[PDB]
Structure 1
């Protein structure tokens, strides 16, 4: 156990992201398009897979 607030603060940077389906890039959670050129700024995004 870390602490509940400290787990929230660490998960803000480590777990509450989104993943581009084409190029696996770690993206902002409210993003609409990937920031990478190689996937062509696609809008195929998924949430980052949580535990539990």
Structure 2
């Protein structure tokens, strides 16, 4: 359908991220602190929820 070789390439920019638990910011997958001033550069993070 979409030749899943590209999905990993495509998901790495859209799905393979991490989310700040306070300001819902989109972060790199291996981030330790959120890069946003309002949330106080908090360390509380969650992975971006995947399909299925």
Calculate the TM-score normalised by the size of structure 2: 0.96
Unaligned residue ranges in structure 2 (runs of 5+) = none
1:14 matched to 2:14? The reply is yes
Q: Distance in 1 between matches of 2:28 and 2:38?
A: 18
- 1:6 deviates by 0.4
For the aligned residue pairs, the C-alpha RMSD in angstroms reads 0.5
What is the Cα deviation at residue 4 of structure 1? 1.3
Unpaired segments ≥5 residues, structure 1: none
How many residues matched? 52
Q: Report SS of the residue matched to 2:46.
A: strand
Query: Normalization by structure 1: what TM-score?
Result: 0.96
Measured against aligned partners, the alpha-carbon deviations of 1:1-52 in whole angstroms (never above 9, x if no partner) come to 3111101100000000000000000000000000000000000100000001
